Subunit: 487 residues, 3 copies
């Protein structure tokens, strides 16, 4: 006739950390952080990305001779570009608002080349110009998308061109103006002086004047070229007029499948896989709600935290050794709480039903809640800046770092707090069960000193299950117990 | 014959949430989130706002003929403007640094129109130009503040004008340049080519050259007009000089009564009402410290939280001895002192514990309100179509800060709810075992959170017991004699 | 033959705060905030700063005659500059991208002046020009680092100049263009009209045109000057070419020592002392991990929080058995174990719970001071008069982040205080109930929180029950006999 209280223990070895103690041991724990990747660039949802190779965005758009494989591109999901591309602008020059164009391009998925000004339409000029900088097989050449207008014979008639956008979507147009290096070159190229280039649309008004100066040679050239761009609207019209130094476009780019994408800076190549999201260092395939690989990602993946370990305790403090004051019992595999019984006719290792289910519900509800709360984390997006906007770059970097630090601190503190609370709740529950049993057993027994007491009158297995069900009736057979303790 | 401990209960049915479980019932609860608005736009401390109606800011400033009701404007409190006003620039063109002007205007309450350059002072030019773009009653017209200088006869003498700012406050001046669409138009208008417009002050020095090209027709016009602005200082002067294509001003705006204001983006209309803080969706009249209507407000108004429920539990768990449930028969205090003597009974309560309980919860609520008084407040801003990066940066800033503060508020509320519940349980248990310890062994524990007094006594006995002055040597001998049986 | 449980008490009168009540007296408390300073500016790590005085950055770089002390400058640590310097541009004008230049200069520790275009090389023009705006001792003068080119006789031949950067590091070059105020002045100064100034490098291409207009008189002059700057790279070349209105440079600045520094907008003068961190109000020499002096600091120094009190408790709640209050005579540990046998008494304390309490306190202190080590730092910046939106956005940045971090710190310390007090109470109660549990029933609880013993034990009994080695079946027959 003996019953005692304890808890289930096993041979686990995982460890967790709390606000007051470190590397403490627990019965069951669940990880929350993913830190492995396959280290490859692979397809996203079956749509292979666009591999720029050695070229650059400007080289691809203008049609550099080297980038001959990019004359027609299918749909893509993200753009892969190197850090310092080689084949950029073959003829030296610049590009106004490069970074704005890149930011706009970041959210475009497909393109469509449209011929807006056929080359042969210029019947009063020369259109076969080319330089040695952009040369193939020794012979000079030029970009594949623009036309160089030079005087034919000995005169340069005024050049006029216009287009009405009836394609069906917004169009992107690029044009350029050439700056010579000395007056003799200007005279022998355009047979005029003091020329101008004027571009007009419904909302854009521009008029540029070529500049002549002496500059250091780049790629064996003393000249320069300056390019500009604009977004042509629906049913609008753009007008071209110049007296020289004009680089007219020959193709227009029409946005067709505007979606969500990004630009990724890496040096890798393209493999054959299929992931759910991509990272510059590789691809991630996991279900945990956290990762610490790289702050910039494309697709869908868990949040990024700048930590290294995040372990959530969901069990008892494993303290292996017939009572709860010495430790748990290895023989308990059914429930989480000890209700060991030992009658005269036999013993048993029963558990308590009420406590186990409430504990299970509490822990699963709390796990769901802690997962759910952090769903509003901050996310980062790549951006570009020129060399005259250092303040903006500093501001952007500070934003990213500050928000990442704040969220990291929040998550770590929450996890440590939760571990501590879980341990305290479990131990509180164990004393709660014990003293509930003690008051239920109105005297009639003495504590041996092993966290449990021995009954002073002989009950039976019916009495055991009656006490277990919280249905013990003290005045029912109290007289025999009184007689026994009278001894 | 015995006394028992319990706690007061009632029939309230409000629900709160905590970290461990959700949707639990407490006797008394408080609310912190306000989520109702009257859906109207009205005054602000008796100062009606400025209702631009169907005009944009540029149209009002330049003096578009449509916005003829805004020629003179009294003091205002905030400015209401539609998303895409119809009457903006009648003559097609552009405005330089529009967004900076709007941001500067966001913190000015009153204006004052001052005539600086009288129209009749130009005695060597023609000042009756106009166009069909800004036409009233069929006849061509122009803006009501600028002057279009054209050639008189067949010559265009150089134009000179100046003004010295002695008004007594900073001034705002606007001028403009005109770009024709062909050489013949320029020759017909100004008789000369290769002209220029020069503007010079003590700090700003500028010079523009008119540009000629062919453009698509907008509003039936091929030309364009470019406008620029500057701020004059006290006791400063500004000099105008040009040979053509000059759009001279006639009125300067003097800044008086600088204060705090804003720009409001809505399609509503002013009504007859009074409020204390205003939102794009309506007014707010409440004393709670939180709301979730709209992030942009004007005037003093509670903090904004992107959530939907915020309830602070200040009571006990509701259930129907203290181990079986509470008692509805107790309303004076909080904790149970069910007394039942031989000659009577009672439902007294511990007045002492109630005092520390109520002051604790009150200062807790006050502190919780206090900690979040330093919230982050958003401010409206405007960006052109060439600063998408800046606009994205600003939007990300706002969303990040709002999310951070929302998370903080929710976590704090849950923490406090759990702490309060555990605290109340702790005081109940502490009172129980303290009473048991004071009573020592001169009784028998009935096992129902109540022990039956074993020593016989009148009201003085347990009166001293609740007073904490129970004397063991008073009734140890008789109790021992009785329990010896 | 009696024992009782208690806790050590002292006479300390330091009050702490918590989320439940205010101004609670404790036994031992720490501090984490520093709020004092010497109110002086002096050397950082033994390297004196650069003291501009009354000259702005432009005045120093161009070589204003007033700032003659700054012709040669040694290494520095940070730059001291008044908010509205007087001796700026002696000749009225402007500067292109002034703020970008200041931001770039914020991270440079030493310069090096190199003569790239000697003055006498211009043999076809006149280089003795000067104005009354920058006048020393009555006679007209000019900037010390620029050359003004005028007509030579009655002709202005085309001016050309070039320089190849072989110095060995990145160089900074400054040039300028002159805007007259009337046509007669332009003719009498340069003999030509419709001139231009052209500057060309491997990356920068520019061509400006002088502008003529009427302007108000500033400093007695109606003209204006416009300056620009660029960064010359390794083995690059810069070409100058103009036909008038050119302000050619004479010295090039070479970036020698690159490091970390900043610009401080102060008003005082350099003093003679040493420090490790510097703030616009004074120097800080402490070891606590927080301060509330000024958001902008230079060097290494604790973090900035916008609070007024951060007190951490690390001891029992001070209050004069354990139910009556503390023990003034307990000076050994933290949990009393009062021993009193028939032959004598004792004041032994528990040496077990003390060590775990101490190590837990140390662990929590380290954790709290370590969690915030990844805080946010503020860096000074400057914005022009047409970038109000940028300045507003920067201010909102700084204020928001500071508020977030100070709120987090206060919340953490309050929770820590609550947990510590509750933990100590739990420890003492647990010790008492554990002692009672081992005692079994051979004593009667007097009511002072401790029980008078039943059967006459001795010092061996006393130390055995102290060690948790009591054996109830060993010696209880005497208790049973005397129970009657
Ligand atoms: C229409 C055209 O392409 N013309 C020239 C072109 C231009 O004259 C100029 O180079 C543009 O910047 O240059 C090309 O020949 C260049 C050649 O010109 C000599 O005069 C000079 O001495 C050489 O050093 C070299 O620059 C070219 O390949 O760039 C093509 C064509 O002759
Ligand atoms: C001084 C003035 O305002 N004159 C004209 C003005 C200008 O001549 C010019 O059009 C503004 O850019 O324009 C207006 O008249 C011109 C009108 O002439 C028709 O023949 C033509 O078909 C129209 O497109 C238009 O150019 C005008 O209506 O804009 C008014 C004024 O007489
Ligand atoms: C560009 O093409 C569109 C499409 O034809 C032109 O819009 C038409 O204009 C005529 C006016 O002569 C109207 O009768 C049609 O109804 C318009 N079409 C539509 C679909 O609205 C537009 O005018 C052209 N652009 C220019 C500058 O002429
Ligand atoms: C603009 O008006 C102001 C005020 O009339 C002029 O300032 C005065 O200038 C004279 C010239 O010596 C001084 O004697 C006065 O003391 C000035 N007034 C004050 C109040 O100080 C100013 O000169 C005028 N601007 C111009 C360009 O003449
Ligand atoms: C500036 O000076 C450098 C240093 O001499 C020049 O670089 C040399 O150029 C010649 C070409 O004739 C090469 O043979 C040398 O090997 C280069 N030197 C080094 C160290 O690489 C440079 O060319 C000069 N700048 C210009 C525009 O000529
Ligand atoms: C080469 C030169 O410096 N010339 C003269 C200049 C110019 O003529 C203009 O004034 C400059 O804008 O002006 C002064 O007369 C003057 O008033 O200080 C000084 C000098 O005699
Ligand atoms: C722990 O016990 C389980 C029980 O099945 C067993 O499989 C496992 O090997 C044990 N681990 C060790 C390290 O013995
Ligand atoms: C104890 O915890 C620390 C973390 O502070 C850890 O580095 C160490 O490995 C742990 N001890 C053991 C035996 O794992
Ligand atoms: C991702 O991992 C799961 C197992 O964790 C596997 O079943 C699945 O095939 C993986 N996905 C890919 C694309 O390899
Ligand atoms: C209370 O909240 C719980 C949360 O799971 C929900 O299941 C339950 O339906 C809610 N009760 C009511 C009455 O809405
Ligand atoms: C706001 O509501 C209270 C509630 O009674 C009312 O007394 C008060 O008049 C209201 N405010 C205004 C401006 O009407
Ligand atoms: C301690 O703090 C409380 C805050 O409620 C304040 O009322 C009291 O005056 C403070 N003590 C002293 C000595 O100022
Ligand atoms: C900083 O304070 C400590 C405190 O004693 C002192 O020893 C040290 O000399 C101080 N440092 C300086 C530079 O004065």
């Amino acid at each position: 006739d003996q019953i005692c209280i304890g808890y289930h223990s096993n041979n686990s070895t995982e460890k967790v950390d709390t606000i007051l103690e470190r590397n403490v041991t627990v019965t069951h724990a669940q990880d929350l952080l993913e830190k492995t990747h396959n280290g490859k660039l692979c397809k996203l949802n079956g749509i292979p990305p666009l591999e720029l190779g050695d070229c650059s965005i400007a080289g691809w758009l203008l049609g550099n001779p080297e980038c001959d494989r990019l004359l027609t591109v299918p749909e893509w999901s993200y753009i892969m570009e190197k850090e310092n591309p080689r084949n950029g602008l073959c003829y030296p020059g610049s590009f106004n608002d490069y970074e704005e164009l890149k930011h706009l391009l970041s959210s475009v998925t497909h393109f469509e080349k449209v011929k807006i000004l056929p080359k042969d339409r210029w019947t009063q000029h020369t259109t076969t110009g080319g330089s040695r900088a952009c040369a193939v097989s020794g012979s000079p050449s030029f970009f594949r998308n623009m036309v160089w207008l030079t005087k034919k014979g000995s005169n340069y008639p005024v050049a006029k061109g216009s287009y009405n956008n009836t394609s069906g979507e917004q169009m992107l147009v690029i044009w350029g103006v050439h700056h010579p290096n000395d007056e003799a070159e200007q005279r022998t190229l355009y047979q005029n002086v003091g020329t101008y280039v004027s571009v007009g649309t419904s909302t854009v008004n521009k008029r540029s004047i070529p500049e002549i100066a002496t500059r250091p040679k780049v790629n064996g050239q003393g000249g320069r070229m300056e390019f500009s761009w604009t977004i042509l609207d629906m049913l609008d019209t753009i007008n071209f007029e110049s007296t020289g130094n004009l680089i007219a476009p020959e193709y227009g780019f029409k946005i067709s499948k505007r979606g969500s994408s990004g630009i990724m800076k890496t040096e890798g190549t393209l493999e054959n896989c299929e992931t759910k999201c991509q990272t510059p260092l590789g691809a991630i395939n996991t279900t945990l709600p956290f990762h610490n690989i790289h702050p910039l990602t494309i697709g869908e993946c868990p949040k990024y935290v700048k930590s290294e370990k995040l372990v959530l305790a969901t069990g008892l403090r494993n303290v292996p050794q017939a009572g709860f004051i010495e430790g748990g019992w290895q023989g308990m595999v059914d429930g989480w709480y000890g209700y060991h019984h030992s009658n005269d006719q036999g013993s048993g290792y029963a558990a308590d039903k009420e406590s186990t289910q409430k504990a299970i519900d509490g822990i699963t509800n709390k796990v769901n809640s802690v997962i759910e709360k952090m769903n509003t984390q901050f996310e980062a997006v790549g951006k570009e800046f020129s060399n005259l906007e250092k303040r903006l770059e500093n501001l952007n970097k500070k934003m990213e770092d500050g928000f990442l630090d704040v969220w990291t601190y929040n998550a770590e503190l929450l996890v440590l707090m939760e571990n501590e609370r879980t341990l305290d709740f479990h131990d509180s529950n164990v004393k709660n069960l014990y003293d509930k049993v003690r008051m239920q057993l109105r005297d009639n027994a003495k504590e041996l000193g092993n966290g449990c007491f021995e009954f002073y009158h002989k009950c039976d297995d019916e009495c055991m299950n009656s006490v277990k069900n919280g249905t013990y009736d003290y005045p029912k057979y109290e007289e025999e117990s009184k007689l026994n303790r009278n001894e």
